[model samples]
Target chain A: GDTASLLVENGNTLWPQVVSVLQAKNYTITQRDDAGQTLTTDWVQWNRLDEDEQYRGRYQISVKPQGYQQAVTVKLLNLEQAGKPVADAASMQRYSTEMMNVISAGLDKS
Target chain B: GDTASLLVENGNTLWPQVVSVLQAKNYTITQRDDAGQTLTTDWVQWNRLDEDEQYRGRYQISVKPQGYQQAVTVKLLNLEQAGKPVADAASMQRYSTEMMNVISAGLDK
Candidate 1:
């Protein structure tokens, strides 16, 4: 199952800031559009602290209005490791959580 | 785990159509907002073929632009029965599928 979405307060205004933060942390910015509502990135290489794991894929951050602010969603899609798609939910969740930490760090800086 | 979102072609244009379809069924439309992008419903029932099960909760349909068309997401949240939250994955998936069927029937009509 895919991970749940994250709601970011002031996400609409902080969209660019978040992307910049992710970029600074080695996440290559693949696409940015949707009028500052979406940011897509890809790591392309597994640079995890653990040498046993390798991951490469796309991560999409979608910011949508959820009332007065924006609900920011981060999804790890098309994930693959060692030339195979990652199908385990626990692994997926772990990856999602790591990416989310990057997003959180980025948000905190802005 | 929550279910993956369903992407609907021409979802922005077909949103009203989808809502009407659900309303035609037994699903009660609780909220429609997000500038024609979100629809929330509640079944308030355990209307299943199996009399042994009971389910009640909220279903949210969120439509967002995915390029030229729209991406529609349906999620089952705050689900519970017998006055407690439903935490079983298999049961949750079953309930979500049934609700999806309702949405599909509504969309098809």
Candidate 2:
């Protein structure tokens, strides 16, 4: 599988904020592009603090509009789980924030 | 997974041209925006012929740029099957066209 930036971030980084929040964002809209356009964020794969088995994804964010505000949907793309935070609010939120940061980071560009 | 139009097409339609090409498209560039922005098309899940076994999908299109022409990179998204055209030229190509159609269809709207 060719992991596009949409799925691969060259590498994933840590976003503890996600641990604080598993799923949210306060989006700043610059283009005001309409909906239907989905920005698929990179995948964040990390293990939990607990055991060597079970849990995590195991997630990728699908960001789009939610009528009033933008949404960074931290969804489990496919499947690969067990143990720890299978859908741990923190893990999902962390992944979401990391992804959102990357997205927001893009708005400025180099 | 919650299939967005990027995965679910409300329903999959027939695209025989894909069978004819299996893996190709003539893209019309309207937005010329930079690369990195991916348009994840709807997933067209279908079964193969012969013995209800081998081949198919088993794919989804990841359309982007290739320098000169816009490339509709048709690759297998994840895991699934066997038989018929595992990377069946038509299946992938048809899926690409169908997805591309939906994409281009959005331009006018």
Candidate 3:
């Protein structure tokens, strides 16, 4: 898919350029469902609870489906980019939260 | 139990006055455990996610137990005030999140 178009769908939180930089570095970007199921296989499992050993530092995305009252989380896991010192899982999860917030707000407006 | 005492146990998130308003109004506030168990029986179920139809608008409180890593949610259930139109379950759930954040921060700090 055109990276530009992808960014648009993702609420334009980050420029395609930045995503490309991470992707080029061998980082796997995974997307999971509310039940913590991954949609993409390349990234890491997303989790928000840094307190939990089992789910510490995993990426997470929460979305409220159209016309639905409840929200679900999409998690990304196993993130690694070459020469980036294998970024801390916890930090990555935090970053993912920022990304998710943008995506969620975008959806809300639409 | 003194309402002030109860608030202290809840990490002082709410003052006695606020709690008094809810209590005096005949609100049923129920508290639950990590597995979504309620400690108090007068509140409503808490849920952050507005997804899954079954869990819509339920009150939820997540806590990371000492030593143990994974966080568990203490859900409140069945919240209703005398004439508050039943306090729309979802709004209550959202309010509980703010409460959880405060309590969690206190624990963290």
Candidate 4:
């Protein structure tokens, strides 16, 4: 089956902080827009870690508050071992951090 | 194994507005973090769409803003009949609209 990112709504207070944390890793948001009314799109990709043994998926988060704060959600795309960490958490964290570094650099430019 | 996420966080904000349209749907929410050191979470429930035949899943939207907007992803865990749409798209869309309505009229409160 093709792996896809599941968008969820975040109702947390510390939104920017969470963004920084994820950026510090290597994860990214697939955009579905470019300008004002244009809707931007984003998605997480999946990969096979152990020869069809298991599949890991990354949860793409989003926010859509109609009247209240919407809580962010993670979608369970594929099945992993009963206890195996779905997708390498360490790897994901590392990637997020790396991405953050790039952003930080861009900031340093100014 | 218990179905869970490999957390990747978000990159979007159509977030709030997309949210309203959703509430107009029929989806509620499951929270995880409320305190400072607290972590929040949410998962969609699955059910048989037909008599021992099909199942439908609702797509919950979220944003971590880790760096960018992660496109909302729809998970496919169950095996459907080749091309049968997993989960009733109509149901999910309706539920989302219903949820939004409840939010509008404070209906589901």
Model 3: how far residue B92 lies from native, Å: 4.2
* Clash count per candidate: 0, 21, 51, 76
Residue B6, model 1: lDDT of: 42
What TM-score does candidate 3 reach? 0.30
List the global CA lDDT of all models: 0.59, 0.32, 0.32, 0.32
Q: What are the interface RMSDs of all the models?
A: 14.3, 14.6, 16.9, 17.0
TM-score of each: 0.45, 0.23, 0.30, 0.23
Q: State which docking tier applies to candidate 2.
A: incorrect
Largest lDDT belongs to which candidate? 1
> Candidate 2 regions off by >4 Å?
A1-35, A39-43, A46-85, B1-109
The residue ranges of model 4 lying beyond 4 angstroms of the native Cα positions read: A1-110, B1-12, B32-49, B56-60, B66-70, B73-109
Error of 2 at A28 (Å): 25
**Error of model 1, residue B65, in angstroms:** 24
B2-103 per-residue lDDT for model 1 (tens digits): 342443434136566666767677677788895967877865565657545566767887666667645556677656765568765434544544454455
Compose the digit string of candidate 1's lDDT tens values, residues A41-101.
8665657687556777678877666666445566777678766787654355445545655
Question: Comparing 3 and 4 by DockQ, which wins?
Answer: 3
Writing each residue's lDDT as its tens digit, candidate 3 over B44-93 gives 33343532322222343333322322232334343333323344433343
CAPRI class of candidate 1: incorrect
